[PDB]
Nucleic acid binder design. Structure first.
Ligand SMILES: [Ca+2]
Lengths: 547, 49, 584, 713, 98
DNA sequence: ACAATGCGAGCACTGCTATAGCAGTGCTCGCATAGAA
């Protein structure tokens, strides 16, 4: 033996693919079986998206976690895990060229540990745009933003984005994030004395890229800016994956190459993962300015391999005293600074926007979305209260009420189902499908996709690039795949009782999918539980920002 | 039951190279270079024999 | 250049989806398209898909009949052959394309994937010159082409007139390989010893003359060769003309070297009636000023017959959809009724449900009962030995030795009947029958009566086969007699369907229609009918039959009867109409 | 019924031609008597795996195993994925043996490189840690396998392991009984059973068990070496014949089987050539029985000859006899099997045509044999096959070509209207030249006769040449120009396996360093570290954009590890005008190998714009139709006639002929380096160079390539 | 590999007639073919001629008809040794021309 | 989204030392480099 048998069997019982077990064997194999398994699991988690492997999820906790706590070789709790790994030279703290690094109590695949550092290096090098003269800036700002009487957060977002090289703007679907970037650059153009200001728009997906322009063009057309209102954004739609040319695969860009621009604005950033970033950042001319946009609480900012989540964490820290004062200087409004911890270049260029003022409410989808972003009591009495009838519709799913859901489910797709029957065969069936959509946390099961598709296709009997439809056995989509997509009506189906897959950000992104009606088939135990859990987060990006 | 071989033209190159590997690889620089100035590779050795 | 072009074509055929590779295919000189054609065809989206469809058909022709049939199908449409032949040097290009096809055809029947062939091409285009089988086929018209051959290929050959344009060259031997003039041995002086090189250089023209002899020897009426005051030595024309160093020069200048003009004088020396020279009178007149004539008054016979009927010999295969292609050929008695893979159903307590699934193991089971002693008990050693040889693990003997018996002493229908009660004399294993079938057997026509008499065939999807005239093969696992009647037994190893619950009188009658085994019944019995009637001189159905037993080996316990086993008794009135259904 | 000597070597063809016109022309067929082996993928495939313990594991060989569906499927490998693995294997440096022990077992010097374990390691080592970061364990990571695609590496790395488990499992000799499970185990380990294959596989297991049981029966003590069994499994498999379709779906193509003389209305015999039909094989020589014959005895000779008789006897209505009359190569004549000779000879000696009743025995005979004998044509589209009478072909398919009713390919170049836009990335002018014809194909009508599957080195690297050495000279150069550490590069290059072995590798490198240094020094000697520049010129009603790298205040300084070329001068000439136009007054040099150089004098922003136009002009016409201009051939003829003195373009018949030499010399190169003409792009325009289009090439390539010479140095 | 080429084919035959057990082989063949006609002889090689004489040279009851033309021996490059012919020319005294 | 050698000529030029002949250093350039059981 060597350990081989145990591992190879793990593939038989599909509990870690071949790449994982092979990688472990060729890199360790002739070393304490521990290091061998470690690499097998590391490469495992990695496959799932996790950037690193916490020594903790590897210290007696996996006796109830990864199914490979089975051992004759695992010499006790071994404690010296840090010691045992570093001992074998398939792992190092970072010095020698090692496939596996051990920084902090995290075990990374080199490529990862580097990608991370490169990320942290980017948010602790963010120099200040000397383009001060607050005098003018404050003007161009007071003019673009009128109702700044009451602390206008979008006006600060801009101010923060115009006085920094790197900045991120986090906001819900119900914020003027779209138009805030509009004036943001409108003033950027304006304060560009002579010339040489190339602004190129982007997004990880072609779908967002799409909107950016047809919206940045809309809200940009309007307002005051004709001083040659045409060195505008090329309205040119780039996949965050073209600029930095990829070719069937390396990239034409890195540390001296493309990114022919001084100002970059990536949207749907909440969908940028560790790998992409890292390169984009170095590939960015030291003379360029990046403006990230997205929603911090979107399941996409927290799912394995994400970052926008971690990056925007230090927001709740508030600005530094001096920055809070400077921004409040640029905007005719005072700017708080709740507790001066540190991340400086970060905290001072982070900025989350909030919905503004309008009598009445944002009710229904609104209230739910907000409370979901925090406490129970809140989340509880908005459902019962007034029965937002249209907007919210919480229904008890457990036992035989599953067949109750199945009904008001075929009911939702009502419009869709009728176009087929009425044989109205044009493309209105397409627009008809995006009117109603089921959402579930799992991929397989009584709930989940594979499972919900069957039990439902059965009811319409007893009664009757990517994400682009025509039944990929969709009908019921994972909150995940639904990202960047929105439907008029939307119903959420959570597991009966279990799974950590059902976290806050998942519920949140699900709710934010609906435009009008939002059905949520769950239990005031699972819902209230999810409401309290918060998608675990791998990484050292949290630490690399605290040095 | 003999099988009529066809290769050879290849079997021969392979052989000429097995000769170059076990005979030239283990050589120490001073010698290796001499050989090099006589022929650069197994390919060249064959075109001669 | 054609080989490359064809390859691009096979890539288009192999995927007309990808807009590029296809265009690329169409761009090939072989397709005879224009620059204009390419253009327009790019700016007209409907005419593009047109082509795509066209190729998607060719892939179809490829998957079904092969490459040759596909390529020829391609050419016939784009009228390739006819056009190429009319395009200067086209005939050569055609024969080569046809050739490739003949080779692309061989290669086909040696790989089971089209892509595997494409691959096959690349390599050959990259690393060629292999056999003489991939050598170029000469054209049947060349028998009217001035022939340019080598002194060597010419030995033995005869020619009316011959020309030796470069018969003066020589090329001095530098490699010191000579034969010792005393011992007549091949010596290799690994040292350029002038003495030995001198010797070799001698043997050189000693062979050149020998070649010269053969060259002049080839012509019948006349032969004219080219001579010149050749000079290799970089010695500034010092009355050199090392012509004397060539076989022909050596004979003209009788050995001794000569002046440039010295040659011209030696030639004149001998030169009358048969010999005569001239000066290298160059010339020009591009024309071979030949014209042509032609009258293509042809046509191809067209047969006035028609396909009509098709005589085949089917066998309850008019059912089972293919995949068994070549399968029922390599193993005539393979457990064709089983197939698939196995996974994590290994539960640490071996049972008949965990016994390796598939055809290879299924036939192993069938095997056991091919010659067993139902009468006496199941010897474990015979079982241990059966698995040992079959490649299985010995640790299956208990489960198996207990499994077999359980099925033996299993009560068939009612009064007694149990395999173990059957002695040799009342058993006939693996009966092979042939039921002639005249008057086309229409799938629909048979579905009707099969319905009325059988409640099982009530699940009427049937008629999944098409008209067939001929014979009807069929093997019967077992036919025995309980001193009164004859029966039909078919051991059927199937399921991976977990346990017991799947081998209930319901589950069984389900898989029955699932695999439409019901047909097997009616057919098989119809055969036993015909046979028994034939043998038993004056026999009656309901007095001699009363049979039909299906044993789904698995899910059969010592004390859970009616589970695993299934029984049916043909309507007798069905067999009646079914029999005459054959010959009316 | 059609019978042939060897039904195996006729099968391809039988299938081929019976693949004809669906309707009308078609008639079903069934081949029988073929061998199991010669007619089933998996068969020879398994027999192959049974040879692992002897294999060298050459690259192409293992990958060959993947072309077998069932084997690939068994390792979750798709035709999609194979294409990557196939590339990585080549690029990672794999080509030899599986292990190191595999190498030593071959009494060879374990280099620890180019074996599979190496190549795989470089791949998994790449899965993580990227190419840079340096060599891990004397191994340099291979990044092409880094993304989710890195998942494939797991599958391949998983196969070779299985192959190795077994290559070592099947190594030692075992007692007969122990080999029993081996066949079954292997099949499950490398094959995910199809349906057809489920059958073929069962056959393997049968013979395997058979061969072993039989040996056990005779109670064989001593152990058995695999070879013994494989070699037997092979033979059996070679004799097991498939002929289940013998009498169902009509027309039976087969061989002459002894003891199976059935009567047929029609009997056809093909390939009845001398040395081919009366099938031979000489008795063992030590088969006593064959020297002293007796009435009961039997031999093939006798069996076959009496077979030919059974045919004639069994042919009720028509006897068809055919043989090959000449090999389609040396065209020498072949002969009919003596048996066939004995038949027509008898026919002719006992028959006479109606006409000839009073002439002669021999004479009447001839006419008869000649009358029944029918000499066929070489090609199916030969018109003789379409006149009236004896066997007019039933294949209209060929008719048109038989009647020379073709329409010769129409001249490929048809001017295509072109609309000169505004704003052409500098790149499109750079990529247009450096070969324009290509540009018309790739640019104007998206035609890229892409060529990639590229030969995998059937061996490790002993020598560096062509494209590789260049690529290596590129980094070594740059590294020496950046006055960086060449030692780093080396190690990296070696860790990838791109360099010859040790002492020889150290030598290779050392001598390249010497040539690259000489080059770099010429760069360093006048390299004034400058920076990027942007292009946005206005020329005769046209714009342009681009990133001219390292632009020095001197101007432009470029260098490359290759020889001088006109195509390369043009490149820099364009990069220059744009530079001169964009303002910046300076110079521009391109340092090449062998001290070559292309140096251009500063131009006045005005005239720069003047030439940047003509180049811009060519791209225009170039987009309408193939703008000739062969930078090398033309550049040659153009360089032989030009003169630095008085900008003297020579016309004298002395050089006008030397030039025509330099030209053809470049168009069609040596037996070593090989001509500009030798190029698909040009090939599709014309296969042979006509003195006409040659002119067009000069006139045209002179019209654009002249400024290059009028200004160099 | 268990394979055999052509050079080997007529080579292994030359060794056999050389070895001790070379007589049972010489005689065996000799009987089967008491008189043999070798054509295109001017192209033989030492290996061939050896086998030939080792079987028929100086042997009553047998005849070796060697026919070809030395003036046409042009296959040196494949191993046709004109010298081994002249050697054979020396050993057999009976000469004839057409 | 990328190119073979090697050998002497050939002639230009540079010391010597009994303007001419012999020699030697050098760089450029044209020339010749298989056959088919
Ligand atoms: Ca059966």
């Amino acid at each position: 033996m060597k350990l081989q048998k145990q591992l190879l069997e793990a593939v038989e019982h599909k509990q870690l693919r071949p790449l994982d077990v092979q990688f472990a064997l060729t890199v360790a194999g002739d070393e304490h079986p521990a290091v061998t398994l470690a690499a097998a699991l590391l490469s495992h988690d990695a496959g799932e998206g996790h950037v690193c492997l916490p020594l903790s999820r590897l210290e007696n906790n996996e006796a109830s976690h990864p199914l490979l706590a089975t051992c004759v070789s695992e010499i006790g709790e071994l404690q010296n895990w840090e010691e045992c790994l570093l001992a074998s030279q398939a792992v190092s703290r970072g010095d020698e060229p090692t496939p596996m690094i051990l920084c902090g109590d995290r075990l990374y695949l080199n490529r990862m540990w580097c990608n991370e550092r490169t990320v942290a290096r980017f948010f602790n090098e963010v120099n200040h745009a000397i383009e001060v003269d607050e005098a003018l800036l404050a003007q161009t700002l007071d003019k673009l933003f009128p109702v700044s009487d009451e602390i206008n957060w979008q006006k600060v977002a801009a101010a923060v984005a115009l006085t920094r090289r790197i900045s991120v703007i986090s906001g819900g679907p119900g914020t003027g994030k779209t138009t805030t970037v509009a004036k943001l650059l409108a003033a950027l153009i304006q304060m560009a004395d002579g010339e040489r200001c190339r602004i190129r728009l982007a997004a990880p997906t072609g779908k967002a890229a799409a909107r950016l322009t047809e919206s940045l063009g809309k809200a940009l057309r309007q307002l005051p800016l004709t001083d040659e209102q045409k060195k505008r954004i090329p309205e040119d739609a780039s996949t965050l994956h073209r600029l930095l040319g990829a070719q069937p695969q390396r990239l034409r860009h890195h540390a001296g190459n493309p990114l022919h621009l001084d100002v970059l604005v990536v949207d749907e950033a909440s969908m940028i993962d560790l790998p992409m970033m890292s390169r984009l950042i170095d590939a960015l001319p030291d003379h360029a300015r990046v403006i990230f946009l997205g929603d911090r609480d979107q399941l996409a900012s927290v799912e394995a391999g994400a970052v926008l989540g971690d990056i925007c964490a230090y927001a709740n820290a508030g600005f530094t005293a001096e920055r809070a004062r400077q921004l409040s200087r640029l905007t005719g409004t005072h700017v708080p600074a709740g507790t001066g911890t540190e991340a400086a270049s970060l905290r001072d260029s982070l900025c989350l926007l909030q919905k503004s003022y309008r009598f009445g409410s944002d009710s229904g989808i609104g209230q739910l979305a907000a409370a979901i972003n925090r406490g129970d009591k809140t989340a509880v009495k908005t459902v019962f209260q007034q029965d937002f009838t249209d907007i919210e519709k919480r229904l008890l799913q457990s036992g035989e009420d599953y067949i109750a859901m199945l009904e008001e489910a075929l009911a939702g797709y009502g419009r869709y189902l009728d176009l087929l029957q009425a044989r109205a065969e044009p493309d209105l069936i397409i627009q008809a499908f995006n009117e109603y959509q089921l959402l579930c946390a799992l991929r397989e099961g009584p709930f989940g996709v594979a499972g919900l598709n069957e039990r439902i296709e059965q009811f319409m009997q007893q009664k009757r690039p990517s994400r682009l439809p025509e039944h990929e056995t969709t009908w019921a989509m994972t909150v995940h795949k639904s990202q960047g997509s929105e439907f008029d009506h939307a119903a959420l189906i959570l597991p009966s009782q279990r799974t950590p897959v059902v976290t806050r950000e998942l519920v949140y992104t699900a709710v934010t999918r609906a435009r009008r009606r939002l059905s949520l088939y769950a239990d005031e135990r699972i819902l209230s539980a999810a409401i309290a859990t918060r998608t675990e987060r791998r990484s050292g990006l949290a630490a690399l920002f605290s040095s | 039951e003999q099988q009529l071989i066809e290769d050879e033209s290849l079997l021969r190159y392979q052989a000429c190279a097995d000769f170059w590997r076990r005979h030239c690889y283990p050589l120490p620089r001073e010698i290796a270079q001499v050989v090099f100035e006589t022929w650069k590779g197994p390919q060249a050795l064959l075109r001669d024999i | 250049l054609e080989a490359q072009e064809m390859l691009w074509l096979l890539q288009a055929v192999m995927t007309p989806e990808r807009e590029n590779t296809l265009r690329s295919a169409l761009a090939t000189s072989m397709m005879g398209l224009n620059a204009l054609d390419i253009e327009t065809l790019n700016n007209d989206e409907h005419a593009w898909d047109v082509v795509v469809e066209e190729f998607d058909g060719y892939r179809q022709i490829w998957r079904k009949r092969g490459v040759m049939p596909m390529l020829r199908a391609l050419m016939s449409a784009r009228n390739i052959a006819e056009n190429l032949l009319a395009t200067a040097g086209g005939e050569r290009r055609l024969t080569d394309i046809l050739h490739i096809s003949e080779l692309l055809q061989e290669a086909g029947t040696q790989l089971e994937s089209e892509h595997a062939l494409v691959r096959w091409l690349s390599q050959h285009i990259l690393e060629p010159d292999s056999n003489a089988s991939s050598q170029q086929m000469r054209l049947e018209s060349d028998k009217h082409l001035v022939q340019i051959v080598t002194i060597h290929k010419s030995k033995g050959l005869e020619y009316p007139l011959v020309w030796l344009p470069f018969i003066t060259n020589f090329r001095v031997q530098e490699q010191a390989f000579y034969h010792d003039r005393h011992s007549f041995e091949a010596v290799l002086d690994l040292n350029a010893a002038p003495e030995s090189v001198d010797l070799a250089e001698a043997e050189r023209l000693a062979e050149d003359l020998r070649l010269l002899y053969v060259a002049l020897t080839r012509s019948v009426w006349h032969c004219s060769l080219g001579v010149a005051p050749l000079v290799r030595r970089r010695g500034d024309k010092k009355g050199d003309t090392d012509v004397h160093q060539s076989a022909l020069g050596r004979l003209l200048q009788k050995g001794e070297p000569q002046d440039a003009a010295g040659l011209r004088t030696c030639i004149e020396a001998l030169c009358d009636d048969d010999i005569a020279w001239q000066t290298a009178q160059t010339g020009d007149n591009q024309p071979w000023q030949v014209n042509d004539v032609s009258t293509a008054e042809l046509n191809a016979k067209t047969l006035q017959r028609l396909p009509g009927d098709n005589w085949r010999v089917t066998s309850y295969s008019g059912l089972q959809q293919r995949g068994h292609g070549i399968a029922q050929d390599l193993m005539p008695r393979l457990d064709v009724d089983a197939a698939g893979v196995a996974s994590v159903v290994e539960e640490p307590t071996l049972t008949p449900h965990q016994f390796p699934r598939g055809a290879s193991p299924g036939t192993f089971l069938h095997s056991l009962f091919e010659d067993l002693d139902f009468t006496q008990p199941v010897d474990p050693n015979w079982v241990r030995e059966k698995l040992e040889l079959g490649g299985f693990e010995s640790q299956w003997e208990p489960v198996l030795t207990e499994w077999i018996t359980a099925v033996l002493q299993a009560p068939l229908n009612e009064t007694g009947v149990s395999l173990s009660q059957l002695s040799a004399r009342n058993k006939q294993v693996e009966m092979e029958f042939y039921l002639p079938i005249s008057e086309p057997l229409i799938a629909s026509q048979l579905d009707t009566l099969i319905r009325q008499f059988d409640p099982l065939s009530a699940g009427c999807p049937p008629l999944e086969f098409m008209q067939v005239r001929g014979m009807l093969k069929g093997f019967i696992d077992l036919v025995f007699r309980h001193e009164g009647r004859y029966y039909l037994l078919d051991y059927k190893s199937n399921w991976l369907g977990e346990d017991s619950s799947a081998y209930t009188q319901q589950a069984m009658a389900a898989a029955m229609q699932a695999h439409r085994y019901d047909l097997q019944y009616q057919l098989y019995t119809l055969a036993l009918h015909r046979y028994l009637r034939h043998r038993i001189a004056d026999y009656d159905y309901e007095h001699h039959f009363g049979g039909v037993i299906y044993l789904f080996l698995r899910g059969v316990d010592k004390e859970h009867p009616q589970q695993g086993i299934y029984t049916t008794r043909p309507n007798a009135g069905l067999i009646a109409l079914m029999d005459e259904m054959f010959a009316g | 019924i059609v019978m042939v000597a060897d039904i195996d070597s006729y099968s391809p063809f039988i299938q081929a031609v019976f693949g004809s016109a669906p309707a009308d022309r078609y008639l079903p067929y069934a081949i029988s008597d073929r061998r199991a082996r010669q007619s089933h993928p998996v068969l020879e495939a398994f027999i192959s795996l049974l040879s692992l313990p002897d294999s060298r594991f050459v690259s192409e060989d293992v990958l060959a195993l993947l072309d077998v569906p069932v084997l690939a499927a068994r390792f979750d490998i798709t035709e999609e994925g194979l294409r990557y693995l196939r590339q990585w294997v080549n690029e990672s440096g794999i080509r030899w043996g599986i292990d190191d022990d595999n190498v030593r077992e071959l009494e060879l010097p374990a280099t620890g490189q180019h074996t599979w374990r190496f190549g795989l390691t470089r791949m998994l080592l790449g899965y993580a840690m990227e190419s840079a970061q340096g060599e891990w364990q004397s191994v340099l990571p291979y990044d092409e396998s880094s993304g989710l695609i890195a998942e494939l590496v797991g599958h391949l790395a998983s196969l070779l392991m299985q192959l190795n488990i077994w290559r070592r499992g099947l190594a030692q000799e075992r007692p007969l009984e122990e080999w029993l499970p081996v066949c079954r185990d292997m099949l499950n380990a490398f094959f995910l059973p199809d349906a057809e294959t489920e059958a073929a596989m069962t056959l393997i297991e049968q013979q395997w068990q058979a061969i072993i049981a039989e040996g056990l029966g005779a109670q064989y003590g001593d152990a058995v070496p695999l070879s013994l069994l494989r070699d037997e499994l092979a033979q059996r498999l070679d004799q097991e014949r498939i002929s289940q379709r013998f009498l169902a779906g009509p027309v039976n193509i087969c061989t002459l089987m002894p003891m199976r003389s059935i009567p047929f209305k029609v009997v056809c015999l093909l390939g009845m050539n001398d040395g081919v039909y009366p099938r031979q094989l000489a008795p063992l020589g030590f088969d006593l029985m064959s020297q002293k014959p007796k009435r009961g005895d039997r031999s093939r000779r006798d069996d076959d000859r009496y077979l030919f008789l059974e045919a004639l006897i069994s042919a009720q209505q028509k006897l068809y006899i055919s043989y090959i009359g000449r090999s389609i190569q040396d065209n020498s004549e072949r002969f009919p099997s003596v048996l066939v000779q004995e038949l027509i000879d008898y026919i002719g000696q006992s028959h006479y045509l109606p006409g000839d009743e009073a002439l002669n025995c021999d004479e009447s005979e001839a006419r008869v044999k000649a009358h029944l004998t029918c000499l066929h044509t070489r090609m199916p589209f030969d018109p003789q096959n379409y006149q009236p009478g004896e066997r007019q072909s039933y294949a209209r398919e060929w008719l048109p070509a038989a009647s020379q009713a073709g329409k010769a390919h129409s001249e490929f170049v048809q001017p295509l209207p072109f609309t000169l836009p505004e704003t052409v990335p500098l790149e499109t002018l750079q990529r247009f030249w450096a070969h324009p014809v290509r540009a018309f194909f790739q640019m104007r009508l998206q035609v890229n006769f892409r060529t990639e599957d590229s030969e995998i080195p059937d061996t490790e690297p002993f020598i560096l040449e062509g494209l590789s050495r260049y690529q290596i000279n590129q980094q070594l150069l740059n590294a020496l120009v950046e006055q960086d550490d060449a030692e780093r590069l080396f190690r990296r290059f070696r860790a990838a396996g791109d360099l010859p072995y040790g002492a020889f590798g150290e030598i290779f490198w050392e001598t390249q360093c010497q040539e690259m240094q000489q080059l770099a020094d010429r760069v360093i000697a006048c390299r004034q570290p400058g920076q990027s520049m942007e292009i946005d010129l206005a020329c005769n009603g046209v714009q342009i954009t681009g990133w001219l790298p390292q632009v020095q205040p001197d101007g432009l300084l470029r260098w490359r590890p290759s020889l001088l070329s006109v195509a390369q001068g043009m490149q820099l000439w364009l990069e220059h005008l744009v530079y001169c136009a964009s303002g910046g007054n300076g110079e521009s040099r391109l340092f090449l190998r062998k001290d070559g150089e292309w140096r251009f004098p500063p131009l006045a922003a005005e005239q720069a714009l003047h030439y940047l136009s003509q180049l811009i002009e060519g791209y225009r016409e170039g987009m309408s139709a193939p703008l000739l201009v062969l930078p090398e051939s033309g550049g040659a003829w153009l360089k032989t006639c030009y003169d630095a003195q008085n900008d003297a373009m020579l016309d004298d018949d002395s050089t006008l002929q030397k030039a025509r030499t330099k030209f053809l010399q470049a168009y069609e190169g040596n037996m070593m380096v090989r001509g500009e003409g030798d190029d698909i792009w040009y090939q599709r325009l014309w296969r042979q160079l006509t003195p006409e289009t040659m002119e067009a090439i000069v006139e045209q390539s002179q019209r654009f390539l002249l400024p290059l010479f009028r200004f160099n140095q | 590999r268990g394979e055999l080429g052509f050079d080997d084919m007529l080579s292994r035959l030359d060794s056999a007639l050389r070895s001790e057990s070379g007589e049972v082989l010489a005689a065996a063949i000799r009987t089967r073919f008491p008189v043999a006609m070798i054509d295109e002889f001017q192209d033989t090689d030492p290996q061939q001629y050896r086998i030939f004489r080792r079987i028929w040279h100086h042997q009553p009851e047998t005849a070796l008809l060697l026919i070809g033309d030395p003036k046409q021996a042009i296959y040196a490059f494949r191993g046709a040794d004109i010298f081994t012919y002249m050697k054979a020319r020396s050993e057999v005294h009976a000469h004839y021309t057409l």
